[model samples]
Target chain A: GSMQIFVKTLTGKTITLEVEPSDTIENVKAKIQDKEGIPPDQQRLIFAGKQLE
Target chain B: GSMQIFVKTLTGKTITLEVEPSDTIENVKAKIQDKEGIPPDQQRLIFAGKQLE
Candidate 1:
């Protein structure tokens, strides 16, 4: 399911992105890397109130 | 100096907290672990627009 995913930055900025349910954590980080300029390795992903490794 | 540290989560939530420049990435993660439910090991910290490992 392609839905809205939010990325909250260290600067208190909330960035929104779209993703599919089939997308893995790495996939989401790739999107963040492109949009937020933060490297995929640098992104800490949290979903459903839990951090995704 | 304790400055505002922003944490952008995977859910597009931007959480802000105060932190000292001297605080190591681990230190920051520890704080985040307290504020957010995510464990310290799961946190990926970015500072100065770069990821801190």
Candidate 2:
């Protein structure tokens, strides 16, 4: 599915990013890491009410 | 809520941590960072099937 992922950060900020089901969770996390300065390891991607591993 | 949080890393390894709802998510990240050396900013903590900010 093609969609945008919304990430909520530690400081209560939300970041939006485009993503695809085929995209590894890491892919999305990488973008967040760069844009938000949060590390990939520190990112928990949630989709469809589930945490993407 | 009091529980154990399971974190999945880029390497497909899962680390389990005990936590409390009162604990800030950053606190958990700090532990993961120390154990895995992934850095707190790089971690993503998922709790109750959601990404814990």
Candidate 3:
């Protein structure tokens, strides 16, 4: 889907970004960064004590 | 990215499904049932002792 995927951005704001079912979490991070001016590496996909790489 | 991602299909079951990281755990379960004939809601995504919503 080209729709926005709702997620808590590292900035602590609930933000929506364009994503699709075929994209990786890595791609999700990049999309977020595209909007937030945050670099992908500095961002983390946090949940259950693990971070997406 | 189109290849299946591995996950435990909570039919008291850990079966293969055509999953991707971008697919919600919700959709993952649905795919499992398409293959296993299991009810989607009967499935749960568990990790680190918590169920994925």
Candidate 4:
């Protein structure tokens, strides 16, 4: 099943991104890159001061 | 200073909203109403299982 999560961009926009609980970080970065056109290398996903990967 | 907060819409879209810490929940609802065109009476902002106001 697909689940949704929120990603707060550097431009101060919160966007909804769908992800699977079993999906790897690379998979998520790919989706973000596809939708946002931002490279994965520059993307950083953090929560509670910890990195996603 | 105005700060940003994330609101997960019932439609599964997460949007960024600007608000001030000194502002009351009614003020927040007003902003949401103005942007989303939803009535304040039907608005419910919850966190940690408690109501926003």
Candidate 5:
């Protein structure tokens, strides 16, 4: 299913990302690389209480 | 000034570190090394603001 998640960076910035469960986890990180320029090799992903807080 | 920042490891882990303007960037990387065991030299120094605007 399609979904949205959030990314909070060390600089206290918030980012919104769109994704699909059908895609592999790597796909999600790839978006970060495209939008945020944080390489997939260095990304650490997790879900918190707020999907869009 | 002092502040808190979040660290997300490549293995999908989260950690918090407190830092100050007086500290060098290496100090922050060193914290990651001490807490996460990631070598300071191997760090990528991510979480920037140069993303989609």
Candidate 6:
């Protein structure tokens, strides 16, 4: 599992984060804001089917 | 957009298929069976949030 799913950052670059299973969608949001500039309140966390818990 | 998402094969291998956007989740199922030996009825196709069309 990854705290961050690889994708473009707010500054238009890429970043990776160390995340754990216990971390919630909100946690990922904060990490993205700090590392990628995508404000935590602006991001969403979603997983579907076999990908979800 | 391609129908099939890259993943492992049925016999523990990997394969790729050129699929179309019109092809539904069911279409990917059929191709997986032929190219990867994964039976359609047993597979599920899922994408969430921005990943979904």
What TM-score does each prediction get for chain A alone? 0.67, 0.66, 0.51, 0.65, 0.66, 0.53
Interface RMSD of the predictions, in order shown? 10.7, 13.0, 9.9, 16.6, 13.9, 11.5
- lDDT per residue as tens, model 5, B1-25: 2345556675766666676534554
| DockQ of every candidate structure | 0.06, 0.05, 0.07, 0.02, 0.04, 0.04
DockQ (model 5, Cα): 0.04
Candidate 1 TM-score versus the reference? 0.43
lDDT of 4 by residue, A1-53 (tens): 24554454555566677665345544555676666666544454321111123
Clashing pairs in 6: none
Candidate lDDT (C-alpha), each: 0.56, 0.52, 0.47, 0.49, 0.53, 0.46
Error of 3 at B27 (Å): 10
Quote the lDDT for A16 in model 5: 67
lDDT of candidate 1 over A1-53, digit per residue (tens): 24556567757776777765344545555777677577665664332234554
Between candidates 1 and 6, name the one with more favorable lDDT: 1
Q: Any idea what lDDT model 2 has?
A: 0.52
Pairs in clash, predicted candidate 5: none
Question: Over the stretch B1-53, how does candidate 2's per-residue lDDT look in tens digits?
Answer: 23555666656766666655344545655666666666554554331113354
lDDT of 5 at B40: 49
Best by TM-score: 1
TM-score of each: 0.43, 0.41, 0.36, 0.39, 0.40, 0.36
Write candidate 1's Cα lDDT for B1-53 as tens digits.
Answer: 24556666656678777765444544555777678667655554332234564
Count of backbone clashes, every candidate in sequence? 9, 10, 0, 0, 0, 0
Query: After aligning candidate 6 to the native by TM-score, how far in Å is the CA of A7 from where it should be?
Result: 16
The reply for model 3, stretches above 4 Å from the true place, is: A1-3, A46-53, B1-53
**Residue pairs in candidate 4 whose N, alpha carbon or C atoms collide under 3 angstroms:** none
TM-score of chain B of each: 0.64, 0.63, 0.52, 0.64, 0.64, 0.54
Candidate 5, Cα interface RMSD: 13.9
